[PDB]
Every structure is written in structure tokens, then in C-alpha cells.
Design an enzyme around this catalytic site. Structure first.
Site, mmCIF file in Angstrom:
data_model
loop_
_atom_site.group_PDB
_atom_site.id
_atom_site.type_symbol
_atom_site.label_atom_id
_atom_site.label_comp_id
_atom_site.label_asym_id
_atom_site.label_seq_id
_atom_site.Cartn_x
_atom_site.Cartn_y
_atom_site.Cartn_z
ATOM 1 N N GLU A 183 0.800 -1.226 0.000
ATOM 2 C CA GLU A 183 0.000 0.000 0.000
ATOM 3 C C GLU A 183 0.838 1.285 0.000
ATOM 4 O O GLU A 183 0.546 2.227 -0.744
ATOM 5 C CB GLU A 183 -0.924 0.063 1.225
ATOM 6 C CG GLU A 183 -2.135 -0.869 1.217
ATOM 7 C CD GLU A 183 -3.117 -0.606 0.088
ATOM 8 O OE1 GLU A 183 -2.958 0.410 -0.639
ATOM 9 O OE2 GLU A 183 -4.051 -1.432 -0.086
ATOM 10 N N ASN A 219 -7.561 10.215 -5.649
ATOM 11 C CA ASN A 219 -8.307 9.465 -6.655
ATOM 12 C C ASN A 219 -9.197 10.490 -7.375
ATOM 13 O O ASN A 219 -10.312 10.790 -6.927
ATOM 14 C CB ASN A 219 -9.184 8.387 -5.987
ATOM 15 C CG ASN A 219 -8.383 7.424 -5.104
ATOM 16 O OD1 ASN A 219 -7.652 6.567 -5.597
ATOM 17 N ND2 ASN A 219 -8.545 7.551 -3.794
ATOM 18 N N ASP A 279 -13.200 9.717 -8.152
ATOM 19 C CA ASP A 279 -14.313 9.881 -7.221
ATOM 20 C C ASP A 279 -14.072 10.921 -6.133
ATOM 21 O O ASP A 279 -14.816 10.980 -5.162
ATOM 22 C CB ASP A 279 -14.710 8.540 -6.591
ATOM 23 C CG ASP A 279 -13.808 8.128 -5.431
ATOM 24 O OD1 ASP A 279 -12.593 8.390 -5.482
ATOM 25 O OD2 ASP A 279 -14.337 7.550 -4.457
ATOM 26 N N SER A 320 -11.826 11.114 -3.741
ATOM 27 C CA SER A 320 -11.436 10.656 -2.411
ATOM 28 C C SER A 320 -9.910 10.589 -2.367
ATOM 29 O O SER A 320 -9.255 10.663 -3.406
ATOM 30 C CB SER A 320 -12.043 9.277 -2.112
ATOM 31 O OG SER A 320 -11.419 8.256 -2.887
ATOM 32 N N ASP A 333 -6.479 8.483 -0.318
ATOM 33 C CA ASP A 333 -5.990 7.355 0.493
ATOM 34 C C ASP A 333 -4.896 7.919 1.398
ATOM 35 O O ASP A 333 -3.967 8.566 0.918
ATOM 36 C CB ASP A 333 -5.389 6.275 -0.401
ATOM 37 C CG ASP A 333 -6.380 5.744 -1.422
ATOM 38 O OD1 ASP A 333 -7.572 5.618 -1.099
ATOM 39 O OD2 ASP A 333 -5.955 5.451 -2.548
ATOM 40 N N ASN A 373 -8.984 4.963 2.813
ATOM 41 C CA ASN A 373 -9.789 5.908 2.036
ATOM 42 C C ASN A 373 -10.784 6.817 2.773
ATOM 43 O O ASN A 373 -11.557 6.390 3.646
ATOM 44 C CB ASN A 373 -10.486 5.148 0.904
ATOM 45 C CG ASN A 373 -11.099 6.066 -0.120
ATOM 46 O OD1 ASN A 373 -12.304 6.322 -0.103
ATOM 47 N ND2 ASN A 373 -10.267 6.589 -1.004
#
Ligand code: NA
Length: 130
Positions: free
Chosen positions: A35, A46, A49, A51, A53, A60
Site C-alpha cells: 500500500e 483518486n 471519485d 477521495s 488514500d 480511504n
């Protein structure tokens, strides 16, 4: 902070992650490795959408933490996403535990499915004294 492998393994064990909801420490290590490369300040926006991380587990903002700029988002871990960018990983661990209390478990992270599921993950904890 960018943890070295074994220091992270012991840190996670101390935080009660070993076998948490049936998830071995090796699985959590494989998750953090893929990750973020064991990097607590890692972030990924991102654009699709809106959002983002956050942190060592790349948690998220749509469902887990509040960053105030994600549309219709919720905050299941009841934390500011800022808390997931600390060198001290206690809050990110509390949140990761929250994530896995849901039906999917460790499967919540697609990277775990891609690089950890049905793989030999023993190498992540070898020699760490855990
Ligand atoms: Na949120």
C-alpha cells in the site's frame, strides 16, 4: 516516517495486530508494504471519485476518515484523515482494525487481494522476533 521492515512488525505486534480478527502479522506487513512501502505520510488522490488514500495502510476518505473535501463521505473510524499521517501509527492501527471488523475483513484492500492473498507472506516477518 518510513519504517524499516522488522521495526514495523514489532510495532504492529505491540499494537495488537497479530491475529487480529484472524489476520496474521505477515498479512498486515504485506498490506503496508504494497500500500505505501511502510510510509506513514503516503497519500494518493483518486481524481475519479474525489477521495484520497491516507498513510501506511492507504485508508480511504470516502468511508473511513474525515478530510472535509470528499463528497457524501462518512467517517467510520471517527478520525480526521490527518491522524492517519502521523509517525506514530496507533490511530491508523485502530482504524485498520475498524476496517476489518466489516464483512470483507482484510479483503477490503484490493492490493491485499492482488499481492498478498494466496501468497507466501512468511518473508515479511522473518527475523523480526515476532
Ligand atoms: Na470521510
Amino acid at each position: 516516517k518510513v519504517f524499516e521492515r522488522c521495526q514495523l512488525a514489532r510495532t504492529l505486534k505491540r499494537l495488537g495486530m497479530d491475529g487480529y480478527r484472524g489476520i496474521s502479522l505477515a498479512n498486515w506487513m504485506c498490506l503496508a508494504k504494497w500500500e505505501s512501502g511502510y510510509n506513514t505520510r503516503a497519500t494518493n488522490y483518486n481524481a475519479g471519485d474525489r477521495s484520497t488514500d491516507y498513510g501506511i495502510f492507504q485508508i480511504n476518505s470516502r468511508y473511513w476518515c474525515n478530510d472535509g473535501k470528499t463528497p457524501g463521505a462518512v467517517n467510520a473510524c471517527h478520525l480526521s484523515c490527518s491522524a492517519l499521517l502521523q509517525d506514530n501509527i496507533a490511530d491508523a492501527v485502530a482504524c485498520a482494525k475498524r476496517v476489518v471488523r466489516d464483512p470483507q475483513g482484510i479483503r477490503a484492500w484490493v492490493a491485499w487481494r492482488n499481492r498478498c492473498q494466496n501468497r507466501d507472506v512468511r518473508q515479511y516477518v522473518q527475523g523480526c522476533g515476532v
